[PDB]
A paper describes a structure:
CIII2 is a dimer with each monomer comprised of three subunits: the Rieske FeS (FeS) protein with a [2Fe-2S] cluster, cyt b with hemes bH and bL, and cyt c1 with heme c1 cofactors. The FeS protein external domain (FeS-ED) is mobile between the b (close to heme bL) and c (close to heme c1) positions. In [name], both the diffusible cyt c2 and the membrane-anchored cyt cy carry electrons from CIII2 to [name] in respiration. Here we report the cryo-electron microscopic (cryo-EM) structure of this functional bc1-[name] SC ([name], at 5.2 Å resolution), together with three structural conformers of native CIII2 (at 3.3–4.2 Å resolution).
Focused classification and processing of the subclass containing ~62,000 particles with the highest initial resolution and best discernable features yielded a tripartite [name] map (SC-1A, EMD-22228) at 6.1 Å resolution (“Methods”), while another dataset produced a map (SC-1B, EMD-22230) at 7.2 Å resolution. Superimposition of the CIII2 portions of SC-1A and SC-1B maps showed that [name] was in different orientations in different maps. The two extreme locations of [name] with respect to CIII2 were displaced from each other by a translation of ~3 Å and a rotation of ~37° (SC-1A in red and SC-1B in blue). Other subclasses identified in 3D classifications showed [name] in various orientations between those seen in SC-1A and SC-1B maps. This [name] interface flexibility is attributed to the limited interaction between the [name] (N-ter transmembrane helix (TMH)) of [name] and the cyt b (TMH7) of CIII2 (top view). In the interface regions of SC-1A and SC-1B maps, additional weaker features that are not readily attributable to CIII2 and [name] structures were observed. However, no membrane-external feature that might correspond to cyt domain of cy, which is an integral part of the cyt c1-[name]-cy subunit, could be discerned in these maps.
Author numbering:
A (entry chain o): 9 to 178, 215 to 234
B (entry chain n): 57 to 527
C (entry chain p): 13 to 52, 60 to 160, 174 to 271, 281 to 295
Write the structure that this text describes.
Amino acid sequence: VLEKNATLLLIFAFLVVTIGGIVEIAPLFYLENTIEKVEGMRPYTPLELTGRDIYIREGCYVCHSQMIRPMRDEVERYGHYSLAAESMYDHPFQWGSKRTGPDLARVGGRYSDAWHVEHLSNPQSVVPESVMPSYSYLANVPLDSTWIEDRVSTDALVGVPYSAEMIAAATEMDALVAYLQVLGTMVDFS
Amino acid sequence: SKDEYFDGVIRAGVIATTFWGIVGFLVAVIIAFQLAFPALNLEFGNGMLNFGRLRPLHTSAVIFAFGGNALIASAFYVVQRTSAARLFGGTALGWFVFWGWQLIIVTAATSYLLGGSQGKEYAELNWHLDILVAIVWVAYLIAFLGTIFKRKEPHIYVANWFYLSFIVTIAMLHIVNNLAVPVSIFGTKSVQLMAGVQDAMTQWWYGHNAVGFFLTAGFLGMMYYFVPKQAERPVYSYKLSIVHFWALIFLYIWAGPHHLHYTALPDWASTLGMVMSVILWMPSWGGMINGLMTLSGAWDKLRTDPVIRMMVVSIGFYGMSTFEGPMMSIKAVNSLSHYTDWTIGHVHSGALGWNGMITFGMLYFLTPRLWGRSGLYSLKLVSWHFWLATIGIVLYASSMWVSGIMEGLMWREVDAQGFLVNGFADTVGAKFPMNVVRGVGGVLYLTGGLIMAYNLWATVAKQPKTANLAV
Amino acid sequence: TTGHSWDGIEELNTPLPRWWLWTFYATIVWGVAYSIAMPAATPGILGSSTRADVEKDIAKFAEMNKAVEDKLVATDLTAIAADPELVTYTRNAGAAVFRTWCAQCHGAGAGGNTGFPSLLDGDWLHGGSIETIYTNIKHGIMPAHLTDELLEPAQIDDVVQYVLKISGQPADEARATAGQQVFADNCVSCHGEDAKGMVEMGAPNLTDGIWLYGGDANTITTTIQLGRGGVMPSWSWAAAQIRAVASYVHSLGG
Ligand code: HEC
Ligand code: HEC
Ligand code: HEC
Ligand code: HEC
Ligand code: HEC
Ligand SMILES: [Cu+2]
């Protein structure tokens, strides 16, 4: 029965619901492949980290994927298919779910900073047909980097290898471009 | 005493359900239009309308605010009646859940456009909001489970199995996926506990199960109460209820990796997701069968009662999406479907067709009763609403399928020489008509929502003091 | 029907639908089969299957189209532009490759825009020869006179006006004398006298017709003030394809 018993039903539900989570999530913490960074890779530089946060704030993810699937055509279009090691540092992970715009994972030099500036400033200007929104404010706002130290410290706590030295050492458009320029670079050079 | 059901909270949640429905769907239409014509985005100045920011607002408002309020109103009404006792938290605990929830949505409205988002889908709100939601949800479970504990009848209706499960699992999912170290006060001024593949897994476990419990299970509870609520008597299958419920509740949690196909996530996990997503097909359909078969003999009612129409069609879309989902969960299919508008097609088929329609019908049924009214102000409007909503959903789905297939194909398509046939821009251009049609379909559905608002309002006007006697 | 009512609702004790049962069981069976077949096997892939299929996809593709690329590679770039077999397939596909990779900077037309060169036309900054174009593609890609004390606020204006005269004829007498003098001193070294320009440097000729580049006096003032600094990213990492593209770009003008 157990129809009648509130506690039993509750307990069984909690138990029934748990198995998939334990089975899928938990072992990942342990598996090395997903944990290991690409050997060459380093953590995001403070400007790039700030830019990544901007990329998050804006909602770039909502149109842009950062995960190259292992198919020939996407390899051809984007580059080497993404590797788990690349995303090891990413709190939170940027893999997309939608590609209104093209995949961003490996823009490890593909465009010049100047291009990125013009495009972000007005995508239509460079790419007339673009659906992408214009982000001119990025030029307007400067970064104080007050918070950057805190952010890196927190990431270190999270496991990112920032040096004490890195924290100490650390416009929005500049940051965004800086971030975009790093993407996927780690694998190619290594 | 307190023999009378506490209608209070259900009334508030119902009205707010309609309100948030309008707000969320309107944002949906607007952002869709933004995809069609980017001008709708502010060119200079981030401002008020920018797609990247608005999108999660649409998401949260539609799911948590609209769907959430629908769930609150429905669960509070349904559990009370199904168990025959007045709500356990009462105005105090339950109303707290109301205001608290309202605060949560309001905070989302302010915070998201402001730019504070974790970037995690369906997770987007900042940590402070996460704590608030955890608190409100905790209160909500105490009220609900307490209501069950206090029940009169020895057995607990299956609808409550679904609601109860939904409650618990969402709480667990929310807490786990939200672990994050706070860097600053808000926005995503927190970084997620996990990273990379692991973060992706936790995210999608959370993300699927969100629709799985929040959108499917909880709504299945709604279906279980409302569909059988009719003049016609018995036709159902209890044993199915049992099999379908447990199997769904168990199997669904495994479905997470279907999002992750052909990604960095390890092959084993992806496969487990695929296999279980396929097994998931059966229980999910068990829900639809249990709902529809109940109607058997009763079908003549469909022409007569539009509320019934809504519930039935709701199940039709539900089954359709619950079929399409398992298919897309196959790696080969996902190979095409992923990152295309098809995913969106799938989402709105379930969203407009299943979730929205059943909640709609649910409200049309309950709101008069809660309001101390025999029925809605105008049945005709419910019918018109039904049509508007149906054409809108179908149009939305069709456009997205065409767009999605076109995109996956165009992206993958290779020439004789082996070169890539289309530029991404070409695919983008191809998508435009799809964007416009989708904009229209969603617009029509939204208009239906407006008609609902008008009708409900008219009915709401009739009586102050609408205690509806004993009940 | 069962004995207990929940507010109105009662439930029939009915059997699970046979088809429903079958489908449920079938899915389960499929799942077990899938797991045995997948990671835990399937034939056709040695070891264990994985995303490894990628290698196979590329490999078969390579077998299928390796010859076309290999044939082209032996041929010189100039030859690969001329020949409609390789040469024509090189323009359409090279043109195919062009759209995917290059079109976003240099235009679908390859006509270009402000800040990016028009590949179609006759004029080449780095040099039009096949080797030059290839080099541009394979290995990828103006001094700030405003600061150099002498140039200043006025010197820049003068040089701008003079260059517009080299390009054509506007009327500003102060902006001309001074500018001629400055150009001969500094600019001429890279752009030459009479602005033929030097391909080696990628210094464009000042004696040009109306192009997409900011001809206006003000725009010239800005480039002279601040200097240029444009990049053509290297396709050697990202990109055989580079060769076909060089053949296509070459074919474009003529
Ligand atoms: C944006 C980052 C570009 C990418 C993508 C492509 N090109 Fe480019 N190219 C770009 C610029 C800004 C310039 C001018 C650089 C300068 O001197 O200031 C160029 C130049 C070339 C040239 C040389 C033209 C000449 O006058 O000699 C060639 C042959 C060329 N680009 C080819 C080319 C190809 C084939 C591309 C796709 C693989 C491509 N470019 C991409 C900017 C950008
Ligand atoms: C939804 C609409 C968006 C938003 C929210 C973002 N982008 Fe994009 N983006 C979009 C489209 C349709 C395109 C293709 C047309 C074009 O190139 O303009 C792009 C393109 C880019 C690119 C170039 C990618 C490439 O060609 O390799 C980049 C680098 C890019 N977008 C960046 C970017 C950033 C940083 C965003 C947040 C500010 C952003 N995009 C949002 C569509 C959309
Ligand atoms: C040495 C290197 C020099 C010096 C001494 C001068 N120029 Fe400039 N110039 C040079 C290059 C390599 C380029 C191309 C820049 C690029 O493509 O990014 C240029 C460009 C110009 C232009 C722009 C042409 C256009 O609009 O596309 C102008 C107007 C120009 N240079 C003028 C100019 C003047 C007036 C100079 C003396 C003050 C001068 N250059 C010096 C290389 C070099
Ligand atoms: C749950 C209820 C729900 C309702 C009701 C709803 N949506 Fe959405 N919408 C979603 C979800 C979930 C997503 C995110 C999809 C994703 O992330 O793949 C979304 C995303 C979107 C997007 C972004 C599409 C893209 O390609 O990025 C648009 C546009 C949209 N919805 C339009 C609409 C319109 C128009 C309506 C008209 C009624 C509507 N929505 C109603 C749930 C809903
Ligand atoms: C709202 C109703 C709804 C129902 C019912 C539903 N899903 Fe979905 N589906 C969604 C949403 C929302 C997303 C988008 C998630 C995202 O943003 O990536 C989605 C996307 C998917 C995708 C594509 C993921 C990707 O990125 O390629 C698959 C596969 C999927 N769901 C499987 C299923 C399965 C399996 C079921 C049931 C057996 C199911 N769906 C039922 C809402 C629903
Ligand atoms: Cu899912």
